[PDB]
Design an enzyme around this catalytic site. Structure first.
Site, PDB file in Angstrom:
ATOM      1  N   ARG A 260       4.293  11.515   3.585  1.00 32.65           N
ATOM      2  CA  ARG A 260       3.846  10.669   2.590  1.00 32.65           C
ATOM      3  C   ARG A 260       2.614  11.276   1.678  1.00 32.65           C
ATOM      4  O   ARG A 260       1.829  11.752   2.316  1.00 32.65           O
ATOM      5  CB  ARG A 260       3.529   9.195   2.821  1.00 32.65           C
TER       6      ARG A 260
ATOM      7  N   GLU B 110       2.183  -5.713   6.262  1.00 31.08           N
ATOM      8  CA  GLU B 110       3.515  -5.632   6.051  1.00 31.08           C
ATOM      9  C   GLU B 110       4.227  -6.762   5.767  1.00 31.08           C
ATOM     10  O   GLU B 110       3.671  -7.861   5.373  1.00 31.08           O
ATOM     11  CB  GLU B 110       4.481  -5.400   7.218  1.00 31.08           C
TER      12      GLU B 110
ATOM     13  N   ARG C  89       1.150   6.785   0.057  1.00 34.39           N
ATOM     14  CA  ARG C  89       0.340   5.893   0.770  1.00 34.39           C
ATOM     15  C   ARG C  89      -1.031   5.799   0.269  1.00 34.39           C
ATOM     16  O   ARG C  89      -1.821   6.863   0.035  1.00 34.39           O
ATOM     17  CB  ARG C  89       0.469   6.218   2.295  1.00 34.39           C
TER      18      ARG C  89
ATOM     19  N   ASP D 267      -5.335  -1.060   4.092  1.00 36.15           N
ATOM     20  CA  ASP D 267      -4.202  -1.389   4.975  1.00 36.15           C
ATOM     21  C   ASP D 267      -3.799  -2.601   4.320  1.00 36.15           C
ATOM     22  O   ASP D 267      -4.648  -3.578   4.535  1.00 36.15           O
ATOM     23  CB  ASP D 267      -4.583  -1.167   6.354  1.00 36.15           C
ATOM     24  N   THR D 268      -2.802  -2.851   3.843  1.00 38.41           N
ATOM     25  CA  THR D 268      -2.167  -4.004   3.691  1.00 38.41           C
ATOM     26  C   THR D 268      -1.326  -4.574   4.665  1.00 38.41           C
ATOM     27  O   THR D 268      -0.808  -3.882   5.357  1.00 38.41           O
ATOM     28  CB  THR D 268      -1.410  -4.158   2.105  1.00 38.41           C
TER      29      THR D 268
ATOM     30  N   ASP E 151       0.752  -1.147  -0.154  1.00 35.37           N
ATOM     31  CA  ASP E 151       0.017   0.142   0.018  1.00 35.37           C
ATOM     32  C   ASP E 151       0.901   1.095  -0.016  1.00 35.37           C
ATOM     33  O   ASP E 151       0.354   2.360   0.147  1.00 35.37           O
ATOM     34  CB  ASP E 151      -1.263  -0.104   1.125  1.00 35.37           C
TER      35      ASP E 151
END
Ligand code: THP
Ligand code: CA
Length: 129
Positions: free
Chosen positions: A75, A37, A29, A34-35, A15
């Site tokens: 970001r 980690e 971002r 939310d992917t 992401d």
């Protein structure tokens, strides 16, 4: 909202991607997702999905929402499209991201992404397996 051109430097993970925006190399971002980690379960898969989706595209575009365009880490915050297909949506539809970090005033595509998430759950895909 509207799409505008984006210039891909490299994919980073599920992401985040690195863009050249106004001549500055910036981590962007993805909004509303939310992917995992990279070294969590489905992390390598989410990374590989985003990476191929953005690299293999003829064109990527970005679309800012109405609120913050950068986060507290500097970001960029955007929806990213590869040949017209929203990466944020495709990740959620395939169960490789959850809908997450939904903040008022940067939440234009919330309902679109919740619809995709519900379908990924109905199909028990990846995160939802
Ligand atoms: C997606 C997104 C994340 N963030 C912040 C929330 C989290 O901050 P905190 O670190 O203080 O918990 C962090 C999650 O990023 P990552 O999921 O990339 O780790 O980035 C925003 O501020 N706005 C957003 O739209
Ligand atoms: Ca993440």
């Amino acid at each position: 909202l509207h799409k505008e051109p984006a210039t891909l430097i490299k994919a980073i993970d599920g992401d985040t991607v690195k863009l050249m925006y106004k001549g500055q190399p910036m981590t962007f971002r993805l909004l509303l997702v939310d992917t995992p980690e990279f070294n969590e379960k489905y992390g390598p898969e989410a990374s590989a999905f985003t990476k191929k989706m953005v690299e293999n595209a003829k064109k990527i575009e970005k679309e800012f929402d109405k609120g913050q365009r950068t986060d507290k880490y500097g970001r960029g915050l955007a929806y990213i499209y590869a040949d017209g297909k929203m990466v944020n949506e495709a990740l959620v539809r395939q169960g490789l991201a959850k809908v997450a970090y939904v903040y008022k005033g940067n939440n234009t595509h919330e309902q679109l992404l919740r619809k995709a998430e519900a379908q990924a759950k109905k199909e028990k895909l990846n995160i939802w397996s």
